[model samples]
Target: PRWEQTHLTYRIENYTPDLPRADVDHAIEKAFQLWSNVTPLTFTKVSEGQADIMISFVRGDHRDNSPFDGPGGNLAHAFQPGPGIGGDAHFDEDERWTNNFREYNLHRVAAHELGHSLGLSHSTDIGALMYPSYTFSGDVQLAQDDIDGIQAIYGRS
Candidate 1:
């Protein structure tokens, strides 16, 4: 088991100044759906204080202990399933997060980090969205390797 619960909730504790709220919302919504499409899981966006997953953007040091490296590398990261900090995802504000492939695509990085939030690890397959580095082609769908790996963990929806 993955997540321990099928219906999970997440909240964008904060937003990155780089993109508009709508763009960030769209990016996060699409990223969650990327995983939901292949698993028997559902994600709900909550506005209340804390949620199962709390997403936030920061620069350099921000609580959690995982300091951002000042851009260009490691755009974001997420925690595995559990409570409190677990399942939360964070994005580095040092990079230019964009909806397009230019600079760094927020949707791409969010999708990949959200994978980690769901307990998925980095994939060796270069074509996989969960690969160590970010690569965007404006394609929001996951590679077959990602589908297989995530499905194996959560089963089909």
Candidate 2:
């Protein structure tokens, strides 16, 4: 089911050593903010227990049906809004995740995966943030298609 409420909460089950804990937290916050900025949604971070959304960084088969490739492929995945694993996001630790252009940007990838978390599907345009293939761009901004798609699921802010 789609998120029926506006004020959603999330918990980071773990962090990646590739970056500082604060950096991972910041990236995730920013990713959630991307949708919140355009929609009538708000996010809160929970330090313990389960949240509306759960975040994790894993390697290889994480037992979610979709197993991640080693490195340089399938950067991450997220479930659509629902109970259980739904709204949970998983990141592949095998990749060289970074904030800058050195390699796969965790912020960008997280933003894309979270789109699915928010009831959005893949877009036809490669430049779109919801595209199936990760378009490696320095700036990961929402395309009109993305905005429209999500807006259809969740009304405008």
Candidate 3:
């Protein structure tokens, strides 16, 4: 389901050792910006207590029914908007997450997962950010399809 409110809070419960902490923060912030720029939604990072979205890195079975299959398979996953486990995102620690183009791009994957956190499902349009597969073309902007999908839920910013 879509989030009922515009302003939302998120927390990075843990960080991957693959990238610098600052870069991780930057990537996550930018990922959220991709949506906020298109919709009437804003994401704030919280240091203490529970937030609407809890982001973290984990490997293998992460308590969630879906489990990671190491480095190359599933990169990350997120839940739809709701209470508790809902809106939480988990990254596969087995994958080498990078801020740049070396390995899996944290910003890119997080952006996709955030789409789910914002209550979006996979888009058949391959050019869309909500597509099931991940791609890196040295571009981070959302496709028109993505904008249309999210705006349909939250409206234009």
Candidate 4:
């Protein structure tokens, strides 16, 4: 399901040592902006308590039934909109997360997972940000299909 409200909050429960604290914060902010720019949604960062979306970096068997495969296999995952676990995005700490066009760009992956958090599933269109695979060339932008999917759920801003 999609978030019924236009304003949403996110909290970075933990940080990944792969990048500096500021870098991680900027990447996550930009990632959420990918969706916020197109939909009526707006995201705010919270340092305490539960937020609508909780972000974290963790390794395998972190208690979630879907344990991440060490390093290479799933880079990250996110739950659909709801309470508790829902809307939370987790990154695989086993993998090196980067802010640039490296093995795994945190900004790009976070953007994709945030799409799932917003209730948008993987898109068949390779150009769409919601595509299941990781594909980037120094830049990432939501394709028209992505905008359509999210707008369909929350309408245009």
Candidate 5:
């Protein structure tokens, strides 16, 4: 699959604790819907790893050669797709994540990491959510190219 392409099914492997499990589900659903609303790709939530995409978080030697740099170094990382560990997302649990949508926007980082898991690379476009750097600004969100990227991958149903 390409960037912005989701598994036929997506599942939450682990829920972040800053919010209730239900809240986490809501946030993850929001991220998925953000792209799906404009594209044909659909992601379904499940419990077990049977789902193609697994959403989880941790630090240092979680499951891959890429380890979380504690905090402030690498906010998160994800696999593109293939065999085991592929399409799994790991957020640095060390960071102080929040739902402010301004400071550590949970859904914001999620949408970005999800992009990587779908095979999207960091964009040179400053307005893109896939920008290599971010400051968690409030009004700052996905851009036209970002949506186009998703649409390009998923196309329209």
Candidate 6:
């Protein structure tokens, strides 16, 4: 199952001083919709642990083994399927993430991290949404590979 058998709810923690709370919330909703639109995975934001996915924003290094890793390297990371932190996704608040960027787009990075949260592996196709590295133009949409792989995982009615 893409988001598994449960509704994927998330809670945000430690927001960055750079981005506004509203922008962060909007970005999260957009990210969830990326998969929720492709499959049956329904998500809600919760006030507490009830959320299936927890999104934490941190700059530089923040526990969880996988750090934000500064401006380069990993912009974000996520836990795989089935467990306590399995569906949790992290955003690198270190980077100046905007709807658009001169070098990298925040929306694009969030889409990629959501892919990881759903147990989707990075694709060999550079055009794939699950692409491991950052790209020049995040202006791209969901390529065929992204749609197909996610469809296979989450399924639909």
- CA lDDT of each prediction against the hidden true structure: 0.89, 0.89, 0.93, 0.91, 0.74, 0.74
Model 5 alpha-carbon drift over 4 Å, by segment: 1-7, 139-141
Model 4, position 126: C-alpha lDDT score: 83
Residue 19, candidate 3: Cα error in Å is 0.5
Q: Name the TM-score of candidate 1.
A: 0.96
**lDDT, candidate 6, residue 37?**
76
Q: What is the lDDT of residue 28 in candidate 6?
A: 74
lDDT string for model 4 (1-157, tens) is 9898889999999999989999999988998888888878999998999999999999999999899999897999999999889999999999989878788998999899999988989999988888888998688888999999999999888
- Lowest summed lDDT across 10 adjacent residues in model 3 is found at 95-104
Q: After superposition, how far is residue 4 of candidate 6 from its true place, in Å?
A: 3.3
Q: In candidate 4, which residue pairs clash? A: none
For model 3, how does the per-residue alpha-carbon lDDT over 79-144 read when each residue is reduced to its tens digit?
999999999999999999987788799999999999999999999988888889888878799999
When summed lDDT is taken over every stretch of 10 residues in candidate 2, the lowest stretch is 131-140
Clashes of 4: 0
Clashes of each: 0, 0, 0, 0, 0, 1
Error of 6 at 88 (Å): 1.2
RMSD of each candidate? 1.1, 1.1, 0.8, 0.8, 2.4, 2.2
**Candidate 6 C-alpha lDDT tens digits along 1-157:** 3444747677876575666778777767887787777787887788766467787778765767876677766778888776787878887776767666664566677788878888888898888778777874645567889989888876753
Candidate 3, residue 125: the lDDT equals 89
Q: For candidate 5, write residues 7-85 as lDDT tens digits.
A: 4677887766777787778777887777677767778887775776778868777857987887687888878865567
Please write out the lDDT profile of model 1 over residues 9-109, one tens digit for every residue: 99998888888899999999999999998899998999986788889988888887889999687889899887778888999999999989797999999
